[PDB]
Short mmCIF file of C-alpha atoms and ligand atoms in Angstrom, two decimals:
data_model
loop_
_atom_site.label_atom_id
_atom_site.label_comp_id
_atom_site.label_asym_id
_atom_site.label_seq_id
_atom_site.Cartn_x
_atom_site.Cartn_y
_atom_site.Cartn_z
CA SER A 1 -27.21 212.13 -29.44
CA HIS A 2 -24.44 211.90 -32.01
CA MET A 3 -21.54 211.72 -29.57
CA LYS A 4 -20.11 208.43 -28.32
CA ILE A 5 -19.30 208.97 -24.65
CA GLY A 6 -17.33 207.30 -21.92
CA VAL A 7 -18.22 207.12 -18.26
CA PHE A 8 -15.40 206.27 -15.87
CA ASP A 9 -15.74 205.35 -12.20
CA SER A 10 -13.71 203.43 -9.67
CA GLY A 11 -16.48 200.80 -9.49
CA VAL A 12 -20.26 200.59 -9.35
CA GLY A 13 -20.86 203.93 -7.64
CA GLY A 14 -20.72 205.66 -11.04
CA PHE A 15 -24.10 204.07 -11.80
CA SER A 16 -25.65 206.96 -9.84
CA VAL A 17 -24.31 209.29 -12.54
CA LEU A 18 -25.25 206.85 -15.31
CA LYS A 19 -28.76 206.74 -13.89
CA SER A 20 -28.96 210.53 -14.17
CA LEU A 21 -27.60 210.40 -17.72
CA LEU A 22 -30.06 207.71 -18.83
CA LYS A 23 -33.01 209.51 -17.26
CA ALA A 24 -32.26 212.62 -19.33
CA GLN A 25 -32.12 210.58 -22.56
CA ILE A 26 -29.46 212.87 -24.02
CA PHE A 27 -26.82 210.39 -25.27
CA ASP A 28 -27.19 207.43 -27.60
CA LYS A 29 -23.92 205.50 -27.07
CA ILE A 30 -22.37 205.09 -23.62
CA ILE A 31 -19.31 203.06 -22.67
CA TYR A 32 -19.09 202.53 -18.90
CA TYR A 33 -15.81 201.41 -17.30
CA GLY A 34 -15.58 200.65 -13.58
CA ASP A 35 -12.18 199.90 -12.05
CA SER A 36 -13.77 197.32 -9.75
CA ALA A 37 -10.53 195.39 -9.24
CA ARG A 38 -9.05 198.37 -7.40
CA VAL A 39 -12.02 200.23 -5.81
CA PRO A 40 -12.15 202.12 -3.50
CA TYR A 41 -10.00 205.06 -4.56
CA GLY A 42 -11.12 207.30 -1.74
CA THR A 43 -9.04 205.67 1.00
CA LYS A 44 -5.85 205.88 -1.08
CA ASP A 45 -3.14 208.44 -1.77
CA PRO A 46 -3.00 211.17 -4.45
CA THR A 47 -0.11 209.57 -6.34
CA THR A 48 -1.94 206.27 -6.68
CA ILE A 49 -5.22 207.92 -7.71
CA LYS A 50 -3.57 210.12 -10.35
CA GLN A 51 -2.02 207.06 -11.92
CA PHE A 52 -5.36 205.23 -11.82
CA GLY A 53 -6.90 208.13 -13.72
CA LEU A 54 -4.28 208.04 -16.46
CA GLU A 55 -4.77 204.30 -16.82
CA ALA A 56 -8.48 204.92 -17.28
CA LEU A 57 -7.67 206.93 -20.41
CA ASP A 58 -5.74 203.96 -21.76
CA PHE A 59 -8.89 201.87 -21.41
CA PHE A 60 -11.04 204.23 -23.49
CA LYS A 61 -8.51 204.90 -26.26
CA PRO A 62 -9.62 202.06 -28.57
CA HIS A 63 -13.29 202.93 -28.05
CA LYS A 64 -13.10 206.21 -29.99
CA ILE A 65 -15.19 208.13 -27.47
CA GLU A 66 -15.66 211.86 -28.08
CA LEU A 67 -16.17 212.87 -24.44
CA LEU A 68 -15.21 211.28 -21.13
CA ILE A 69 -17.31 211.74 -18.01
CA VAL A 70 -15.33 211.11 -14.82
CA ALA A 71 -18.28 210.09 -12.67
CA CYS A 72 -16.05 209.45 -9.69
CA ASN A 73 -15.74 212.41 -7.36
CA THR A 74 -12.43 211.08 -6.02
CA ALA A 75 -10.84 210.71 -9.44
CA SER A 76 -12.42 214.05 -10.37
CA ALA A 77 -10.78 215.74 -7.35
CA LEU A 78 -7.34 214.12 -7.69
CA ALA A 79 -6.77 212.96 -11.29
CA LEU A 80 -8.82 215.12 -13.62
CA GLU A 81 -6.28 217.86 -14.28
CA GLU A 82 -3.63 215.28 -15.13
CA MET A 83 -6.06 213.36 -17.32
CA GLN A 84 -7.02 216.49 -19.25
CA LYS A 85 -3.36 217.42 -19.85
CA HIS A 86 -2.91 214.06 -21.60
CA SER A 87 -6.20 213.95 -23.51
CA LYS A 88 -7.29 214.96 -27.00
CA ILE A 89 -11.02 214.85 -26.03
CA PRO A 90 -12.96 216.80 -23.42
CA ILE A 91 -13.02 215.22 -19.99
CA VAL A 92 -15.79 216.42 -17.68
CA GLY A 93 -15.67 215.55 -13.98
CA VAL A 94 -18.38 215.86 -11.35
CA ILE A 95 -16.98 218.64 -9.14
CA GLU A 96 -17.18 221.70 -11.39
CA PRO A 97 -20.76 221.00 -12.56
CA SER A 98 -21.79 220.89 -8.90
CA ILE A 99 -20.18 224.27 -8.28
CA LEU A 100 -22.36 225.62 -11.10
CA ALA A 101 -25.40 223.97 -9.55
CA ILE A 102 -24.59 225.68 -6.24
CA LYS A 103 -24.18 229.04 -7.96
CA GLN A 104 -27.58 228.61 -9.60
CA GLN A 105 -29.41 227.19 -6.61
CA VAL A 106 -27.79 228.88 -3.59
CA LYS A 107 -27.71 232.66 -3.96
CA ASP A 108 -26.99 233.27 -0.23
CA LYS A 109 -23.16 233.16 -0.29
CA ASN A 110 -23.14 232.82 3.53
CA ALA A 111 -25.48 229.84 3.63
CA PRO A 112 -23.81 227.00 5.59
CA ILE A 113 -22.73 224.43 2.98
CA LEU A 114 -21.45 220.98 4.02
CA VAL A 115 -19.33 218.93 1.59
CA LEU A 116 -19.48 215.17 2.07
CA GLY A 117 -16.98 212.92 0.34
CA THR A 118 -14.34 210.28 0.58
CA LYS A 119 -11.23 210.94 2.61
CA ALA A 120 -9.20 211.68 -0.53
CA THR A 121 -11.88 214.01 -1.94
CA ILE A 122 -12.21 215.94 1.30
CA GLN A 123 -8.46 216.11 1.99
CA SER A 124 -7.94 217.53 -1.53
CA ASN A 125 -10.10 220.58 -0.68
CA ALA A 126 -11.28 220.42 -4.32
CA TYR A 127 -14.80 221.58 -3.31
CA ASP A 128 -13.78 224.11 -0.66
CA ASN A 129 -11.39 225.86 -3.02
CA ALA A 130 -13.85 226.08 -5.90
CA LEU A 131 -16.57 227.28 -3.56
CA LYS A 132 -14.33 229.93 -1.99
CA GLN A 133 -13.37 231.15 -5.49
CA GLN A 134 -17.10 231.73 -6.14
CA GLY A 135 -17.57 233.73 -2.93
CA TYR A 136 -19.05 231.11 -0.61
CA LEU A 137 -17.88 231.89 2.91
CA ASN A 138 -19.66 229.34 5.12
CA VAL A 139 -18.20 226.07 3.72
CA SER A 140 -17.59 222.99 5.91
CA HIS A 141 -16.32 219.57 4.82
CA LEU A 142 -16.62 216.07 6.27
CA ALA A 143 -15.11 212.80 5.10
CA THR A 144 -17.68 210.04 5.60
CA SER A 145 -15.61 207.07 4.46
CA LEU A 146 -17.73 204.22 5.83
CA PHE A 147 -20.79 205.34 3.87
CA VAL A 148 -19.13 203.85 0.79
CA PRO A 149 -18.81 200.22 2.04
CA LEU A 150 -22.15 200.48 3.80
CA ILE A 151 -23.83 201.43 0.56
CA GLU A 152 -22.03 198.69 -1.35
CA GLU A 153 -23.42 196.17 1.17
CA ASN A 154 -26.91 197.58 0.34
CA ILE A 155 -27.33 198.91 3.87
CA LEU A 156 -29.48 201.90 2.99
CA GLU A 157 -31.68 201.86 6.09
CA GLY A 158 -31.77 200.59 9.61
CA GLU A 159 -29.91 200.90 12.85
CA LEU A 160 -26.42 200.49 11.45
CA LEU A 161 -26.81 203.34 8.93
CA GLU A 162 -28.46 205.54 11.58
CA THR A 163 -25.51 204.92 13.96
CA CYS A 164 -22.99 205.65 11.20
CA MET A 165 -24.78 208.90 10.34
CA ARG A 166 -24.74 209.79 14.04
CA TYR A 167 -21.06 208.93 14.24
CA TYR A 168 -20.08 211.27 11.42
CA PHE A 169 -22.68 214.03 11.90
CA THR A 170 -22.90 214.57 15.69
CA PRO A 171 -19.55 216.44 15.82
CA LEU A 172 -20.77 219.11 13.36
CA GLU A 173 -20.81 222.65 14.75
CA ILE A 174 -22.95 224.25 12.00
CA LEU A 175 -26.34 223.00 10.92
CA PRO A 176 -26.16 222.92 7.09
CA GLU A 177 -28.67 224.46 4.72
CA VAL A 178 -26.93 222.81 1.72
CA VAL A 179 -25.29 219.35 1.64
CA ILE A 180 -23.05 218.47 -1.30
CA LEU A 181 -23.18 214.76 -2.10
CA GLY A 182 -19.57 214.76 -3.22
CA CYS A 183 -19.36 210.99 -3.75
CA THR A 184 -21.00 208.68 -6.28
CA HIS A 185 -22.54 206.53 -3.62
CA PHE A 186 -24.27 209.10 -1.46
CA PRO A 187 -27.43 209.63 -3.60
CA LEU A 188 -28.52 206.18 -2.42
CA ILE A 189 -28.87 207.54 1.19
CA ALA A 190 -29.98 211.04 0.19
CA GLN A 191 -33.38 210.70 1.87
CA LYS A 192 -31.81 209.21 5.00
CA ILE A 193 -29.37 212.13 5.25
CA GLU A 194 -32.27 214.53 4.81
CA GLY A 195 -34.30 212.60 7.36
CA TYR A 196 -31.37 212.68 9.78
CA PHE A 197 -31.20 216.44 9.81
CA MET A 198 -34.96 216.97 10.02
CA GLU A 199 -35.21 214.52 12.90
CA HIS A 200 -32.29 215.77 15.00
CA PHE A 201 -32.60 219.54 14.43
CA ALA A 202 -36.41 219.88 14.34
CA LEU A 203 -36.29 221.09 10.77
CA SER A 204 -39.54 221.17 8.82
CA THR A 205 -37.72 221.03 5.48
CA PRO A 206 -34.41 219.23 4.95
CA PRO A 207 -31.24 220.92 3.78
CA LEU A 208 -30.81 221.13 0.02
CA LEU A 209 -28.84 218.15 -1.32
CA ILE A 210 -26.66 218.65 -4.43
CA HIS A 211 -26.58 215.47 -6.60
CA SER A 212 -23.43 215.05 -8.69
CA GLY A 213 -25.14 213.15 -11.46
CA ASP A 214 -27.93 215.67 -11.89
CA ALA A 215 -25.50 218.60 -11.96
CA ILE A 216 -23.31 217.09 -14.66
CA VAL A 217 -26.34 216.22 -16.79
CA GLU A 218 -27.44 219.87 -16.55
CA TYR A 219 -23.99 221.14 -17.48
CA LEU A 220 -23.66 218.80 -20.45
CA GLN A 221 -27.13 219.69 -21.74
CA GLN A 222 -26.21 223.38 -21.82
CA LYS A 223 -22.62 222.95 -23.03
CA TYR A 224 -23.45 220.63 -25.96
CA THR A 225 -26.99 221.81 -26.84
CA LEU A 226 -28.45 218.37 -26.23
CA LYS A 227 -32.17 217.76 -26.67
CA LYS A 228 -33.66 216.04 -23.64
CA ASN A 229 -35.66 212.85 -24.21
CA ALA A 230 -34.14 212.50 -27.67
CA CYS A 231 -32.31 209.17 -27.13
CA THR A 232 -34.85 206.74 -25.71
CA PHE A 233 -33.05 203.47 -26.65
CA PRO A 234 -29.35 204.12 -26.05
CA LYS A 235 -26.62 201.58 -26.47
CA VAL A 236 -24.82 201.04 -23.16
CA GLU A 237 -21.74 198.77 -22.87
CA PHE A 238 -20.33 197.77 -19.46
CA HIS A 239 -16.64 197.13 -18.81
CA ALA A 240 -14.67 196.46 -15.65
CA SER A 241 -11.20 195.57 -14.37
CA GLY A 242 -12.83 193.00 -12.08
CA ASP A 243 -15.52 190.54 -13.07
CA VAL A 244 -17.78 192.13 -15.68
CA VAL A 245 -20.80 189.96 -14.84
CA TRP A 246 -20.56 191.08 -11.23
CA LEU A 247 -20.47 194.72 -12.31
CA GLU A 248 -23.45 194.20 -14.68
CA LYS A 249 -25.51 192.61 -11.94
CA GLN A 250 -24.86 195.66 -9.77
CA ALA A 251 -25.78 197.92 -12.69
CA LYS A 252 -29.17 196.22 -12.79
CA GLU A 253 -29.68 197.17 -9.12
CA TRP A 254 -28.34 200.72 -9.22
CA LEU A 255 -30.17 201.65 -12.41
CA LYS A 256 -33.54 200.15 -11.37
CA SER B 1 17.12 182.05 11.67
CA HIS B 2 18.58 182.43 8.19
CA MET B 3 15.84 182.11 5.51
CA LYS B 4 14.98 185.31 3.65
CA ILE B 5 11.20 185.33 3.81
CA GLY B 6 8.47 187.37 2.21
CA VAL B 7 5.16 188.27 3.75
CA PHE B 8 2.29 189.17 1.42
CA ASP B 9 -0.99 190.87 2.26
CA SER B 10 -3.52 192.98 0.40
CA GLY B 11 -2.62 195.93 2.58
CA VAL B 12 -1.96 196.70 6.24
CA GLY B 13 -3.98 193.90 7.78
CA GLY B 14 -1.06 191.52 7.35
CA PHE B 15 0.71 193.40 10.13
CA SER B 16 -1.33 191.26 12.50
CA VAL B 17 0.56 188.25 11.13
CA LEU B 18 3.84 190.20 11.12
CA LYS B 19 3.27 190.96 14.81
CA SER B 20 3.02 187.26 15.62
CA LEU B 21 6.13 186.59 13.53
CA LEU B 22 8.21 189.30 15.17
CA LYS B 23 7.23 188.22 18.68
CA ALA B 24 8.37 184.65 17.96
CA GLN B 25 11.79 185.99 16.86
CA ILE B 26 12.24 183.05 14.49
CA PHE B 27 13.22 184.91 11.27
CA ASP B 28 16.05 187.36 10.58
CA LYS B 29 15.06 188.91 7.25
CA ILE B 30 11.45 189.77 6.40
CA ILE B 31 10.25 191.53 3.23
CA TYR B 32 6.67 192.76 3.69
CA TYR B 33 4.59 193.65 0.63
CA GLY B 34 1.09 195.10 0.95
CA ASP B 35 -0.98 195.64 -2.22
CA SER B 36 -2.37 198.86 -0.73
CA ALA B 37 -3.30 200.31 -4.14
CA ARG B 38 -5.94 197.59 -4.65
CA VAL B 39 -7.05 196.56 -1.12
CA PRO B 40 -9.57 195.18 -0.20
CA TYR B 41 -9.52 191.85 -1.87
CA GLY B 42 -12.37 190.33 0.12
CA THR B 43 -15.21 192.18 -1.69
CA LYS B 44 -13.92 191.15 -5.10
CA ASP B 45 -14.28 188.13 -7.31
CA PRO B 46 -12.27 184.88 -7.46
CA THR B 47 -10.75 185.59 -10.87
CA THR B 48 -9.44 188.97 -9.75
CA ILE B 49 -8.10 187.63 -6.47
CA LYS B 50 -6.34 184.66 -8.07
CA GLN B 51 -4.57 187.01 -10.45
CA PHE B 52 -3.66 189.35 -7.55
CA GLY B 53 -1.98 186.37 -5.93
CA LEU B 54 0.12 185.56 -8.97
CA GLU B 55 1.12 189.22 -9.23
CA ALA B 56 2.42 189.07 -5.66
CA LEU B 57 4.85 186.43 -6.83
CA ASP B 58 6.05 188.86 -9.50
CA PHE B 59 6.67 191.53 -6.90
CA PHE B 60 8.90 189.14 -4.93
CA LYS B 61 10.89 187.89 -7.94
CA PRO B 62 13.91 190.27 -7.58
CA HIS B 63 13.97 189.69 -3.82
CA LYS B 64 14.88 186.04 -4.31
CA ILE B 65 13.08 184.95 -1.11
CA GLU B 66 13.18 181.37 0.22
CA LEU B 67 9.64 181.17 1.66
CA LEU B 68 6.52 183.23 1.06
CA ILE B 69 3.96 183.78 3.81
CA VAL B 70 0.53 184.71 2.48
CA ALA B 71 -0.74 186.60 5.51
CA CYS B 72 -3.99 187.46 3.75
CA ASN B 73 -6.80 185.04 4.50
CA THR B 74 -8.59 186.07 1.30
CA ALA B 75 -5.57 185.41 -0.91
CA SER B 76 -4.90 182.23 1.07
CA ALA B 77 -8.46 181.04 0.45
CA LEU B 78 -8.60 181.78 -3.28
CA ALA B 79 -5.11 182.14 -4.73
CA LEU B 80 -2.78 179.91 -2.73
CA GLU B 81 -3.16 176.77 -4.83
CA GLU B 82 -2.34 178.55 -8.09
CA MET B 83 0.48 180.50 -6.54
CA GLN B 84 2.02 177.25 -5.24
CA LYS B 85 1.82 175.65 -8.70
CA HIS B 86 3.58 178.75 -10.12
CA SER B 87 6.40 178.92 -7.53
CA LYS B 88 9.66 177.05 -6.94
CA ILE B 89 9.78 178.07 -3.26
CA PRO B 90 7.29 177.09 -0.56
CA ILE B 91 4.29 179.29 -0.01
CA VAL B 92 2.42 179.02 3.26
CA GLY B 93 -0.98 180.59 3.79
CA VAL B 94 -2.97 181.25 6.92
CA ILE B 95 -5.83 178.77 6.50
CA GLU B 96 -4.17 175.36 6.89
CA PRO B 97 -2.18 176.31 10.02
CA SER B 98 -5.42 177.41 11.58
CA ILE B 99 -6.88 174.00 10.79
CA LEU B 100 -3.92 172.50 12.71
CA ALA B 101 -4.48 174.80 15.65
CA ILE B 102 -8.12 173.65 15.82
CA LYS B 103 -7.11 169.97 15.69
CA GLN B 104 -4.73 170.72 18.57
CA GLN B 105 -7.04 172.88 20.72
CA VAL B 106 -10.55 171.59 19.92
CA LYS B 107 -10.77 167.86 20.57
CA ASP B 108 -14.60 167.80 20.57
CA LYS B 109 -15.37 167.41 16.88
CA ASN B 110 -18.98 168.44 17.60
CA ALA B 111 -17.97 171.74 19.15
CA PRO B 112 -19.83 174.51 17.28
CA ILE B 113 -17.22 176.43 15.28
CA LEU B 114 -17.93 179.81 13.68
CA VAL B 115 -15.73 181.02 10.81
CA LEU B 116 -15.60 184.78 10.37
CA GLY B 117 -14.05 186.15 7.19
CA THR B 118 -14.40 188.40 4.18
CA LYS B 119 -17.17 187.78 1.67
CA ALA B 120 -14.70 186.03 -0.64
CA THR B 121 -13.07 183.88 2.06
CA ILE B 122 -16.46 182.67 3.29
CA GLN B 123 -17.89 182.08 -0.18
CA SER B 124 -14.85 179.90 -1.00
CA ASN B 125 -15.74 177.54 1.91
CA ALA B 126 -12.00 177.00 2.32
CA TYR B 127 -12.32 176.71 6.12
CA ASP B 128 -15.46 174.54 6.05
CA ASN B 129 -14.01 172.09 3.54
CA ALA B 130 -10.82 171.68 5.56
CA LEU B 131 -12.62 171.40 8.89
CA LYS B 132 -15.11 168.86 7.51
CA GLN B 133 -12.24 166.81 6.06
CA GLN B 134 -10.79 166.70 9.58
CA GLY B 135 -14.10 165.38 10.97
CA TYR B 136 -15.50 168.58 12.50
CA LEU B 137 -19.29 168.26 12.18
CA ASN B 138 -20.69 171.54 13.57
CA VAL B 139 -19.14 174.28 11.39
CA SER B 140 -20.90 177.56 10.64
CA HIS B 141 -19.58 180.55 8.71
CA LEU B 142 -20.38 184.26 8.55
CA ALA B 143 -18.99 186.92 6.22
CA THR B 144 -18.50 190.12 8.24
CA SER B 145 -17.34 192.45 5.46
CA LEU B 146 -17.77 195.77 7.21
CA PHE B 147 -15.41 194.84 10.05
CA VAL B 148 -12.50 195.46 7.64
CA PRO B 149 -13.27 199.14 6.83
CA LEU B 150 -14.27 199.84 10.44
CA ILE B 151 -10.95 198.46 11.64
CA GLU B 152 -9.00 200.46 9.05
CA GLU B 153 -10.69 203.62 10.36
CA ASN B 154 -9.39 202.55 13.80
CA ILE B 155 -12.93 202.07 15.06
CA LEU B 156 -12.20 199.31 17.56
CA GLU B 157 -14.75 200.25 20.20
CA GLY B 158 -17.88 202.25 20.78
CA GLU B 159 -21.43 202.16 19.60
CA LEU B 160 -20.68 201.95 15.87
CA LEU B 161 -18.67 198.76 16.32
CA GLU B 162 -21.22 197.38 18.80
CA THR B 163 -24.02 198.04 16.32
CA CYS B 164 -22.02 196.46 13.53
CA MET B 165 -21.43 193.30 15.57
CA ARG B 166 -25.16 193.17 16.33
CA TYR B 167 -25.94 193.48 12.65
CA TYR B 168 -23.78 190.44 11.79
CA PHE B 169 -24.20 188.35 14.97
CA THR B 170 -27.88 188.73 15.85
CA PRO B 171 -29.06 186.22 13.17
CA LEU B 172 -26.78 183.48 14.55
CA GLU B 173 -28.78 180.44 15.67
CA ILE B 174 -25.80 178.52 17.12
CA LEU B 175 -23.69 179.96 19.91
CA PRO B 176 -20.04 179.26 18.97
CA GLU B 177 -17.61 177.50 21.27
CA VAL B 178 -14.84 178.45 18.83
CA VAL B 179 -14.53 181.48 16.57
CA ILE B 180 -11.98 181.50 13.76
CA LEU B 181 -10.64 185.00 13.08
CA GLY B 182 -10.38 184.15 9.38
CA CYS B 183 -9.24 187.66 8.37
CA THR B 184 -6.08 189.67 9.02
CA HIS B 185 -8.03 192.50 10.55
CA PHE B 186 -10.15 190.68 13.14
CA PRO B 187 -7.46 190.24 15.86
CA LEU B 188 -7.87 193.95 16.48
CA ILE B 189 -11.47 193.43 17.71
CA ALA B 190 -10.92 189.97 19.24
CA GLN B 191 -11.72 191.10 22.79
CA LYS B 192 -14.80 192.94 21.50
CA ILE B 193 -16.04 189.76 19.80
CA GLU B 194 -15.40 187.77 22.94
CA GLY B 195 -17.24 190.41 24.98
CA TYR B 196 -20.17 190.39 22.58
CA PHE B 197 -20.79 186.67 22.93
CA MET B 198 -20.46 186.74 26.71
CA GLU B 199 -23.00 189.54 27.04
CA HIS B 200 -25.68 188.59 24.50
CA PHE B 201 -25.46 185.03 25.82
CA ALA B 202 -24.40 185.48 29.50
CA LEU B 203 -21.31 183.27 29.11
CA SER B 204 -18.90 183.14 32.03
CA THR B 205 -15.97 182.55 29.63
CA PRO B 206 -15.73 183.55 25.96
CA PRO B 207 -15.73 181.27 22.93
CA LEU B 208 -12.21 180.21 22.00
CA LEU B 209 -10.74 182.48 19.31
CA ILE B 210 -8.25 181.21 16.71
CA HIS B 211 -5.72 183.87 15.61
CA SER B 212 -4.28 183.24 12.14
CA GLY B 213 -0.91 184.77 12.89
CA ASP B 214 -0.20 182.69 15.95
CA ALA B 215 -1.32 179.55 14.13
CA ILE B 216 1.10 180.11 11.23
CA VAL B 217 3.96 180.87 13.65
CA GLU B 218 3.38 177.56 15.44
CA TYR B 219 3.22 175.73 12.12
CA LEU B 220 6.41 177.29 10.74
CA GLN B 221 8.35 176.69 13.94
CA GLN B 222 7.60 172.98 13.70
CA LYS B 223 7.85 172.61 9.92
CA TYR B 224 11.29 174.26 9.71
CA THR B 225 12.53 173.42 13.23
CA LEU B 226 12.90 177.10 14.05
CA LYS B 227 14.09 178.03 17.52
CA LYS B 228 11.97 180.83 18.96
CA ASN B 229 13.93 183.86 20.23
CA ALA B 230 16.89 183.23 17.89
CA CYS B 231 16.55 186.47 15.88
CA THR B 232 16.36 189.44 18.22
CA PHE B 233 17.19 192.21 15.66
CA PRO B 234 15.62 191.20 12.34
CA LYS B 235 15.82 193.27 9.17
CA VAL B 236 12.24 194.14 8.20
CA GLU B 237 11.51 195.93 4.93
CA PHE B 238 8.16 197.39 3.83
CA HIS B 239 6.93 197.62 0.26
CA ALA B 240 3.58 198.68 -1.12
CA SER B 241 1.74 199.29 -4.37
CA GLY B 242 0.19 202.41 -2.84
CA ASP B 243 2.15 205.02 -0.93
CA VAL B 244 4.67 203.06 1.12
CA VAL B 245 5.11 205.92 3.60
CA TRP B 246 1.40 205.58 4.37
CA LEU B 247 1.79 201.83 4.81
CA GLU B 248 4.89 202.19 7.02
CA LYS B 249 3.01 204.65 9.24
CA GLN B 250 0.22 202.10 9.72
CA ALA B 251 2.80 199.44 10.59
CA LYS B 252 3.89 201.51 13.60
CA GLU B 253 0.32 201.33 14.93
CA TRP B 254 -0.43 197.70 14.12
CA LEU B 255 2.89 196.42 15.55
CA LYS B 256 2.75 198.51 18.77
N1 DGL C 1 -16.44 206.65 -6.67
C1 DGL C 1 -15.87 207.19 -5.43
C2 DGL C 1 -16.36 206.37 -4.23
C3 DGL C 1 -15.75 205.02 -4.18
C4 DGL C 1 -14.24 205.12 -4.11
O1 DGL C 1 -13.74 205.60 -3.06
O2 DGL C 1 -13.56 204.79 -5.12
C5 DGL C 1 -16.26 208.67 -5.27
O3 DGL C 1 -17.12 209.15 -6.03
O4 DGL C 1 -15.70 209.38 -4.42
N1 DGL C 2 -6.37 190.77 4.16
C1 DGL C 2 -7.78 190.44 3.96
C2 DGL C 2 -8.63 191.54 4.58
C3 DGL C 2 -8.64 192.80 3.74
C4 DGL C 2 -9.04 192.49 2.29
O1 DGL C 2 -10.24 192.15 2.06
O2 DGL C 2 -8.15 192.56 1.39
C5 DGL C 2 -8.11 189.12 4.63
O3 DGL C 2 -7.31 188.69 5.49
O4 DGL C 2 -9.16 188.50 4.36
#
């Protein structure tokens, strides 16, 4: 409520986290920056992504933010440690809050958990390592790269999404009880992913989906003793490396 | 057989143009630069893309090249004019040579022509304007954005690509006689596009496809009086804004 906060993402996907933040009404001043000139990060190499993350700090320096949310799971997996080393404010990414959500919500440490993410996020084993450190023993991972461009084309239903889901999911050995939506974009197809598993494995109830935005809202509420529903008319500024009007038009859609 | 040339693309797609160049054996020194940290360009805005094009000129400054090939159809569509104004050496893009190839190969100016490209290339109407100025009266265009990420995942066949072509091609009202592959990536699915139009319309021969790389080779060979097969062992150098080892590994596959 007092704190001026930053939200960093590679592009418009971070609006899924911003939506979660706004719904909770916990912050009163939010500065969003999407690196839309250079998105996606997920298909790129660690060196490049780490440098992207440091350059994001340069963007926020003049804004005098008191906390930075790295809404991007890819930048969280690859760049967050380096950004924190070179940062006088707290930087909170979206991986660790989801590990806490799993701890709270998934007491069966042998439940089959499936981590979905970009190629860079999955190849970093960020989630697998943190989950193993907390005793989870039945952890699978799957890079679902094409979900990102599909979702940015607003293809959230239909034959093409069903065939893409089939393409990525048919090779899975284990049926998951928990799916980690380890990418900003994947909340927009959360019901379709749930519907995919109910349809094809005769489930009555879908696996549990972990939403990165909801988990970080929960963590920040606890960590900063934030009253929910306290900030009903926040100030939100949008910034981008690409065209800002384009990014603002997409914000209108993602935050609806 | 002596000019030091540069080839610029947003990433690895420009290897389809490099393939055409190498086969023609017309140049002896080629400096390839892919902006792999920021690819794709085609989903981004004109201001961003124009500036990307000028920054490519900066990359090439120490290389002191004599001709720049803009292999990227998106940069050619949006950035070429400004780059040419800001350059003392000739810059050749991949749109105008394709207009020449159509003039040469398509004498019926009422032949239905379909331009396929990125969202930005199509929105620019670069192809339509040039075709119309040459008297072609039956020009349609179609942005097929998702072909790019599919192709970069090496998905060049199978039901996902078939479903993606149906998604983009089913709404077509005109059956093309000629299809312009107005994107670096689309040569890799050229047969699949040909096959699609023969099946869903029973053709006994496919629409004619225009390949950007072959069209620029033919143009350069006439413009500079270059003797094919003169340079059997060219020096080819790869540069990238992302990890250049990753880019070089993709070259091996695209140039095969
Ligand atoms: N924001 C990225 C998805 C888009 C990208 O690859 O940059 C993530 O959360 O993984
Ligand atoms: N090189 C681009 C395709 C990839 C991109 O969008 O940057 C083109 O030829 O249009």
